[PDB]
């Protein structure tokens, strides 16, 4: 049977954050991928 | 005005989930990260 092959590990990962300062809370980008794990 | 953002993951290109192979890489020391660091600057240039 014919099977397709896709490499794993979609996209990066960025990292939003303040200043120190500010506070500590941070939002996680995962660039080009669509919300699967969450 | 401005070119296509690219980033290129020098860790997955050079070597594609191996741990053998990642240690080699970090055995150059910062060169991967020389190049990432270059190709996020590229991309804030651009937008800039």
């Known amino acids: ?38 | 005005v401005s070119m296509t953002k690219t980033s290129v993951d020098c860790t997955m290109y050079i070597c594609g989930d191996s741990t053998e192979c990642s240690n080699l890489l970090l055995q150059y020391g910062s060169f991967c990260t020389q190049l990432n660091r270059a190709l996020t600057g590229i991309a804030v240039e651009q937008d800039k």
């Not at chain 1, 092959?5 to 990066?12: D, E, N, R, V, Y």
């Not at chain 1, 990292?15 to 794990?37: F, K, M, R, W």
């Open chain 1, 1 to 38: 049977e014919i099977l397709d092959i896709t490499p794993c590990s979609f996209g990066g990962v960025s990292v939003i954050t303040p200043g120190t300062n500010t506070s500590n809370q941070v939002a996680v980008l995962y660039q080009d991928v669509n919300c699967t794990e969450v």
